[PDB]
Predict the 3D structure of the following.
Amino acid sequence: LLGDFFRKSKEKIGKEFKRIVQR
């Protein structure tokens, strides 16, 4: 179930990409 794989990365990226692409 890859979907789980992304959930782990998406969460890591989400927080990281959230602070890098700050508008």
User: Anything to note?
Assistant: DSSP finds one helix and no strands in the chain. The radius of gyration is 10 Å. The first helix runs from residue 2 to 20.
